[PDB]
Amino acid sequence: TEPKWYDITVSKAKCPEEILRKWLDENGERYAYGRERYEHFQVRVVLRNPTSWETMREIWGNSGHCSPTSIRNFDFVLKEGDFVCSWIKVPD
Ligand SMILES: [Mn+2]
Ligand code: NA
Ligand code: NA
């Protein structure tokens, strides 16, 4: 089965946040991302559909660098910072 869990490092200069967010909403069942400085979005996503790594590499091109992940959690958002999550938190 092709992977569903991917980490992606997305270049903001090549992919504005709103384009990334729309793609994540359309293609991810669950996702979260942070920002690290050229600013990059550091994404983890579980895709709705199994998708080959080669497909992911082609559709992101040099705008993002992706890799299937064996990690199965979004707990990086528990650290300090401003993160975007696909689900609703208590203060949202
Ligand atoms: Mn969604
Ligand atoms: Na958080
Ligand atoms: Na949230």
Author numbering: 2 to 38, 43 to 97
Per the authors:
Replication initiator proteins (Reps) from the HUH endonuclease family process specific single-stranded DNA sequences to initiate rolling-circle replication in viruses. Smacoviridae is a family of small CRESS-DNA (circular Rep-encoding single-stranded DNA) viruses. Named after a triad of residues, the HUH motif in the nickase domain is most often made up of two histidines separated by a bulky hydrophobic residue (U), but can also be histidine–U–glutamine. Recent comparisons of CRESS-DNA Rep-domain protein sequences show that smacovirus Rep domains are both the smallest in size and the most divergent in sequence of the CRESS-DNA viral Reps.
